[PDB]
């Protein structure tokens, strides 16, 4: 088990879109952001990977090393300080994505946590979750896909730490996202993203799918909400992956090509839909730390090894 890097209480991230539609990447701003957030993304990949190794192998050294890394950053009060604003709220967005990765990683190795590790990690995740919720109480921040990503970490913290209040807030974010699904399966706030509208429909669906998957650990069927409305979005996304024709004729910008993200590994098992997800499934792999790590592995073996 390698030594964890030091936990920084402050986040200093930088947005890299040039335009209003948040779709034209400034490659200078993107590199500046990637360097400034490199240790955060590096930590998220690591706890995702190690918690992957535990679910894959049963190996208790992978669980302990995950818990050791999480406890260290809890002790450091990592990300519990200043969210530095340069040009946008990219720092608040990183705090949502980082809670997502660390909470999901904590959930996957939680059965191996002793009461002393829990007493250190639980309050740290609960403070990040409350801070991520309180970010949205400002009525002038529009609740797009960021809100759905925010909800995933709050829900996983609510479930990991047995906090029913953070669990209900997680559901509230998921329900908001499901209620955004239009007749055509589009999301208005994601349709406004120009050449990345199709990207941001896949990007919005993934945390909704993972939140429905967490509710399934507790035996609830969130997929069924609003007469399976989520199926219209997942269905609209998988067809954009194949043929971007519908999206280009509704957006006023030629879509960049999209390979579906790893929500397909879970969703193909819940609503097979005659095998429309088969092509995406066969063209992985599907690793995203901010969604919990190895989505292929968690889809076939379970998000947790015991309830």
Residue numbers in the entry: 23 to 329
Can I see the authors' text?
In order to visualize and understand the effects of pH on Smlt1473 structure, we have crystallized and determined the protein structure at different pH values (5.0, 5.5, 6.5, 7.0, 8.5, and 9.0). The atomic superposition of all the crystal structures across the entire range of pH values did not show any significant change as a function of pH. However, significant rotameric transitions of important substrate-binding residues such as K42, K162, R163, H221, and R312L have been observed at different pH values. At the entry site, the residues involved in rotameric transition are H221 and R312, of which H221 has an altered orientation in all structures above pH 5.0, whereas R312 has an altered orientation only in the pH 7.0 structure due to a hydrogen bonding interaction with Y225. At the exit site, K42 exhibits an altered orientation only in the pH 6.5 and 9.0 structures, whereas in pH 5.0 and pH 5.5 there is no change in orientation; interestingly, at pH 7.0 and 8.5 a lack of electron density precluded analysis of the residue orientation. For K162, the altered orientation was observed only for the pH 6.5 and 9.0 structures; for pH 7.0 and pH 8.5 a lack of electron density precluded analysis of residue orientation.
Unlike other PLs, Smlt1473 present in the clinically relevant Stenotrophomonas maltophilia strain K279a demonstrates a wide range of pH-dependent substrate specificities toward multiple, diverse polysaccharides: hyaluronic acid (pH 5.0), poly-β-D-glucuronic (celluronic) acid (pH 7.0), poly-β-D-mannuronic acid, and poly-α-L-guluronate (pH 9.0). To decode the pH-driven multiple substrate specificities and selectivity in this single enzyme, we present the X-ray structures of Smlt1473 determined at multiple pH values in apo and mannuronate-bound states as well as the tetra-hyaluronate-docked structure. We have built and refined the structures from residues A22-L330; electron density for other residues outside this range was either weak or absent. The structure is composed of 13 α-helical segments (α-1 to α-13) connected by 14 loops (L-1 to L-14) and two β-strands (β-1 and β-2) (Fig. 2, B and C (i and ii)).
